Amino acid sequence: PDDRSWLEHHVVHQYWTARPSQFPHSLHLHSNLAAVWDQHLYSSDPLYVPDDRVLVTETQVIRETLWLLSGVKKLFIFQLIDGKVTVRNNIIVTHLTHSCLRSVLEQIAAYGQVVFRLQEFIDEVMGPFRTYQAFMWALYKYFISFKEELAEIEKCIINTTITLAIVVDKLAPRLSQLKVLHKVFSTGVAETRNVVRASHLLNTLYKAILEYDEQTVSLLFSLWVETVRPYLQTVDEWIVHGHLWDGAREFIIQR
Amino acid sequence: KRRCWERVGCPPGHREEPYLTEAGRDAFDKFCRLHQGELQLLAGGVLQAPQPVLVKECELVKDVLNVLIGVV
Amino acid sequence: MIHELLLALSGYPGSIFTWNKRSGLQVSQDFPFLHPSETSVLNRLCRLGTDYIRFTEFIEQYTGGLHGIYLRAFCTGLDSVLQPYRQALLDLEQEFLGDPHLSISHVNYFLDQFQLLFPSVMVVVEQIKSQKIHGCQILETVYKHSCGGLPPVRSALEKILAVCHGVMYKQLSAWMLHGLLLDQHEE
């Protein structure tokens, strides 16, 4: 009423409260698919209940997928159920009856799990090991340039709107590197002493450069130099200050 | 250029559904009433909260600049 | 329908067009807003998307099992030959912004050009999978088929062979400048 009527009739709140969709309709095919899709549901048995849930349009899902891939987490869709994000399937999207859409959002949430792991390694310091810290710094320098692109793309939805397929094919040269980052982080959390706990990640990083020796190996190189900063700093301290830096023996040489 | 996954085939087409953080400087008034209502429900009915809006950007700036001189 | 099919043609196994290891992308749901002769048309079309799924699976599966630096190059080339198919599906999507009354046979007709490239390059990957050819002889078994008879399959196998020669010439640069051998230990 008055204010709330304007809020419901020009924007959503049929997406966080179970209400019918206010996204405009007419009759027949794209307009209102409800009648013919109800007929298809009835003809092939809708089991014993017609398939009907809260219903949301595409653009809300588009900006949520870009928010999830961008770096922020815990959205309305891509709920974290036990430690890994997955699609909320109690929402209907009327065509495809959210079964093919479940597969495509399940792949996107599988990438969001990698995003969650990197942001989780980020979160365990902000809000020392001194080699993990230099690792998460170059990780930050990646993510600032990374979600810059997604913010630019999400601006173009507001200025007419652009479909989901274009924006998931737009982020391919970043997701191709995200698979490399997924294989990089796996031995960085897999682990006794603090020197082998850094050696396990750094030898994997040294080995992964030879795997791609395009655009991935340059990212691996710029990441790799910024994780051996404490070792070069410590070696230079051993030269000119005459003393090996001590961190409960972070360094390789027993001394 | 977006065709929804809700419905396919022969659209007339209609725009974006706007967002709620989209255009964040015109809907203060609706919610300053609504936050007042959520406060009044817990407070019994008389607590209130002045300034649901005022005034502009520039007039508020000129008054705040007059505060530092000494004019209240 | 004319985005759902285009989703099944790309790197998704659908559920409308059911992915099976005995018969990929079957249409069995006989839609009463499809014409019944489109079923055979979909049976013509779905072999192409099945091949696209298999090539997508081959890139997703192998980065051991089929290693060698040359098949890291081969999956790099296989992604490059699947890119213009993505471009063509984007062109179809823009066309359906233009005219949404076009039937499924128009879509099959538009993607009849890629039914000349994809079945001919499918057999090369099947020969690579069936026989133990994963080393520099993968460059051989591409080069036997890259001398072909159709300009699209010539271009696709050109891309794949090109990135494999790129790996080989970098390791020949280690041969001629550093004296280094077994850069990749044998093959």
Side-chain angles (χ1 to χ4, degrees):
Chain A
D2 192 15
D3 52 52
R4 275 310 307 253
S5 61
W6 174 277
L7 289 165
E8 295 169 54
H9 291 327
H10 300 244
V11 177
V12 292
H13 304 174
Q14 63 272 16
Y15 186 30
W16 294 270
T17 306
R19 312 190 298 113
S21 184
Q22 301 311 111
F23 193 70
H25 307 276
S26 190
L27 196 73
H28 169 252
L29 293 181
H30 195 129
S31 289
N32 203 33
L33 194 74
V36 288
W37 206 251
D38 271 15
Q39 293 332 104
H40 165 74
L41 274 172
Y42 294 161
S43 69
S44 66
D45 299 342
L47 247 306
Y48 63 94
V49 175
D51 286 359
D52 189 26
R53 296 100 166 95
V54 58
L55 181 55
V56 69
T57 189
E58 189 184 306
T59 61
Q60 319 304 276
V61 181
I62 294 179
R63 295 208 73 220
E64 285 183 352
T65 48
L66 293 159
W67 281 325
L68 170 82
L69 291 166
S70 68
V72 302
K73 54 198 68 62
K74 295 292 309 165
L75 296 174
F76 185 69
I77 303 187
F78 309 120
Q79 56 182 357
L80 189 146
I81 56 157
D82 54 357
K84 162 174 203 284
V85 297
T86 189
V87 56
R88 186 184 296 248
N89 290 131
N90 299 359
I91 308 189
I92 186 158
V93 180
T94 310
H95 169 72
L96 315 161
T97 185
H98 64 270
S99 51
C100 179
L101 190 68
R102 184 180 183 270
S103 70
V104 309
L105 295 168
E106 182 172 17
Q107 297 182 0
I108 293 167
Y111 297 136
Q113 169 66 7
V114 186
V115 170
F116 181 76
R117 289 155 73 245
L118 293 173
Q119 287 328 108
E120 157 171 63
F121 179 80
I122 275 161
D123 200 12
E124 285 174 88
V125 189
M126 303 301 172
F129 199 85
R130 293 300 185 70
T131 312
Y132 290 159
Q133 183 165 97
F135 181 37
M136 60 81 72
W137 161 235
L139 205 62
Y140 283 139
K141 287 183 75 163
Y142 168 80
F143 287 123
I144 196 67
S145 52
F146 173 46
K147 156 186 181 185
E148 203 181 291
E149 313 302 290
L150 290 92
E152 183 175 295
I153 283 164
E154 282 202 71
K155 184 171 71 68
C156 314
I157 306 298
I158 317 178
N159 296 115
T160 192
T161 176
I162 308 303
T163 189
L164 176 63
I166 287 180
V167 310
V168 291
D169 293 342
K170 206 60 175 188
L171 183 62
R174 300 289 190 158
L175 291 162
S176 46
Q177 294 167 330
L178 193 58
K179 197 48 69 175
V180 182
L181 293 193
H182 155 64
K183 281 319 191 184
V184 159
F185 189 47
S186 65
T187 61
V189 65
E191 170 165 63
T192 298
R193 292 164 62 68
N194 49 3
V195 60
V196 74
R197 278 166 48 114
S199 187
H200 189 210
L201 174 61
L202 268 63
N203 193 37
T204 290
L205 288 169
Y206 198 63
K207 277 183 52 180
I209 291 149
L210 300 178
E211 187 165 29
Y212 307 100
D213 192 7
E214 305 185 73
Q215 52 179 335
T216 49
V217 69
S218 56
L219 170 64
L220 284 183
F221 189 65
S222 49
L223 181 73
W224 166 238
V225 294
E226 291 192 69
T227 60
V228 302
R229 296 285 87 84
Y231 286 90
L232 291 167
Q233 200 168 268
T234 304
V235 164
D236 190 37
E237 191 184 302
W238 206 11
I239 319 305
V240 306
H241 288 146
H243 181 60
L244 199 64
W245 186 74
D246 299 320
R249 280 184 179 181
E250 186 57 79
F251 208 70
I252 53 173
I253 297 313
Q254 305 311 276
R255 174 176 182 276
Chain B
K1 291 170 71 70
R2 183 263 301 155
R3 307 304 190 185
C4 299
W5 307 115
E6 299 174 294
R7 317 175 286 271
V8 292
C10 305
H14 54 93
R15 311 305 304 171
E16 206 205 358
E17 182 71 23
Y19 292 92
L20 185 63
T21 51
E22 177 180 325
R25 307 187 172 167
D26 46 5
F28 293 104
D29 48 354
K30 281 74 176 176
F31 181 74
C32 280
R33 301 170 275 181
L34 294 175
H35 176 213
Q36 268 171 102
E38 284 167 59
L39 281 176
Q40 296 297 103
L41 181 71
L42 304 178
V46 187
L47 164 80
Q48 311 319 125
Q51 291 302 288
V53 74
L54 278 175
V55 190
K56 304 296 201 297
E57 186 162 62
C58 65
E59 298 195 72
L60 197 43
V61 163
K62 286 191 298 303
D63 281 1
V64 175
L65 287 157
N66 289 332
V67 171
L68 286 181
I69 312 300
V71 165
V72 296
Chain C
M1 213 44 62
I2 49 161
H3 288 135
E4 156 186 276
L5 164 75
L6 304 194
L7 288 173
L9 287 164
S10 55
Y12 313 100
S15 61
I16 301 299
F17 304 106
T18 56
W19 179 248
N20 190 20
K21 290 306 192 184
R22 331 182 55 161
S23 58
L25 299 176
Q26 290 183 271
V27 57
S28 299
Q29 297 82 68
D30 277 355
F31 314 152
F33 70 115
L34 296 185
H35 188 269
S37 72
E38 309 308 307
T39 47
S40 53
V41 163
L42 284 161
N43 288 356
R44 181 168 185 231
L45 190 41
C46 65
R47 295 148 197 179
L48 170 54
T50 296
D51 298 341
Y52 189 93
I53 288 154
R54 208 77 62 82
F55 290 166
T56 289
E57 272 168 27
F58 201 83
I59 306 150
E60 293 293 328
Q61 273 176 263
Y62 291 115
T63 14
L66 278 180
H67 75 99
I69 192 63
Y70 291 114
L71 189 152
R72 277 162 307 214
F74 187 94
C75 286
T76 307
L78 195 55
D79 199 6
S80 65
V81 307
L82 302 176
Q83 179 59 55
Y85 198 87
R86 301 186 188 106
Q87 178 72 89
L89 295 171
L90 279 168
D91 305 332
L92 279 166
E93 169 172 79
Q94 293 164 93
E95 180 185 66
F96 300 139
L97 307 181
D99 272 343
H101 325 296
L102 304 187
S103 68
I104 317 299
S105 59
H106 187 94
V107 188
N108 191 27
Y109 196 45
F110 189 86
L111 299 180
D112 197 29
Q113 314 160 215
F114 299 95
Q115 294 205 117
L116 322 177
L117 191 158
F118 281 67
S120 43
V121 296
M122 183 69 178
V123 181
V124 181
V125 191
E126 291 293 327
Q127 284 182 278
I128 287 156
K129 282 159 61 153
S130 54
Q131 302 147 57
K132 303 308 284 178
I133 293 171
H134 37 82
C136 294
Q137 301 327 279
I138 192 166
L139 288 88
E140 154 67 26
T141 186
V142 170
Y143 196 73
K144 168 176 183 55
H145 303 97
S146 67
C147 69
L150 295 174
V153 61
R154 285 163 186 177
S155 50
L157 292 177
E158 175 182 286
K159 298 183 207 161
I160 292 172
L161 186 86
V163 289
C164 294
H165 294 105
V167 171
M168 184 151 69
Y169 284 127
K170 285 194 307 183
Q171 312 202 14
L172 282 159
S173 69
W175 177 263
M176 285 183 224
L177 278 81
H178 298 80
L180 285 172
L181 61 84
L182 303 176
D183 296 288
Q184 169 63 32
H185 67 278
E186 182 178 1
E187 250 161 324

